[PDB]
Chains A and B, each alone.
Chain A
Amino acid sequence: LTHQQKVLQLYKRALRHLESRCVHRDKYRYFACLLRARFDEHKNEKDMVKATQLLREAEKEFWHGQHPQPYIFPESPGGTSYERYECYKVPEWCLDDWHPSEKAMYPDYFAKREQWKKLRRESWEREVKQLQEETPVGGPRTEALPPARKQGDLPPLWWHIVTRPR
């Protein structure tokens, strides 16, 4: 929200739309260079209101530079992927029950997996203590998850060890 990411975002997606504009990448280059100067003369003034003003002017002047189908790299939401594979992600709590036959189909996996079940079954008391300790009243101010000081796990780990993309 600060001037930093405001300006820097406008710069970044400005380069993005500019990418989508031209072709052969060289014209994109020296145009992007003229822009590099267009923001390069900037930033050397600590005057307060003048700046945000001129920025907004770059918000309209930028908004002119949007053609409706800006280039979107595949993995983010966009017309290529954004979880093409999503029917392939099966959470590890499934397979908690397979048939003991098929549980014997792959005999050594559930060994280590059992070392995890004990890893985090032994845990969560250390976790709840550390968290209930650290949180300021209500835990309002922090969306973060600070680490553990004693030797061991980082407390809210379980979902953060994920089924991976394909």
Chain B
Amino acid sequence: SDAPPLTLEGIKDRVLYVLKLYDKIDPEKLSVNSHFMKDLGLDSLDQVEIIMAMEDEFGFEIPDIDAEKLMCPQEIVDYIADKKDVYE
């Protein structure tokens, strides 16, 4: 079975959750629209880290070429959304 799917609410809560666990920036501004770099100015090497440990959160895929350009959180949710099987 391996029953539970990842739904939109769930994945949202997850990317959102772990990005709130990232310490060096505050939960202050975190939103699917809230810009993943320009807002927080985080290192691009550090977004490589974000996609690293987030992949280790969901455990799959994420090729380097597509991982490069990801950015905003809603977008990450989208990539995981079409790659996994998500929508109703």
A interface residue numbers (CB < 8 A to B): 4-5, 7-9, 11-12, 15, 19, 39, 43, 73-76, 164-165
List 22 A–B pairs whose Cβ atoms lie within 8 Å, in order of A's numbering: A5-B64, A5-B65, A7-B45, A8-B44, A8-B45, A8-B64, A8-B68, A9-B64, A11-B45, A11-B48, A12-B48, A12-B64, A12-B67, A15-B49, A43-B45, A73-B59, A73-B61, A74-B59, A75-B59, A75-B60, A75-B61, A76-B61
Q: Mark B40-68 against chain A: 1 for CB-CB distance below 8 A, else 0.
A: 00001100110010011001110111011
Q: In the complex the two chains form, is B60's CB within 8 Å of A76's CB? A: yes
Residues of B within 8 Å of A74, CB to CB, are 59-60
Q: Mark B54-88 against chain A: 1 for CB-CB distance below 8 A, else 0.
A: 01100111011101100000000000000001000
Alpha-carbon gap, A39 to B52, bound state (A):
16
Residues of A within 8 Å of B49, CB to CB, are 15
Q: In the complex the two chains form, is A39's CB within 8 Å of B68's CB? A: no
Residues of A within 8 Å of B61, CB to CB, are 73, 75-76
Q: In the complex the two chains form, is B52's CB within 8 Å of A15's CB? A: yes
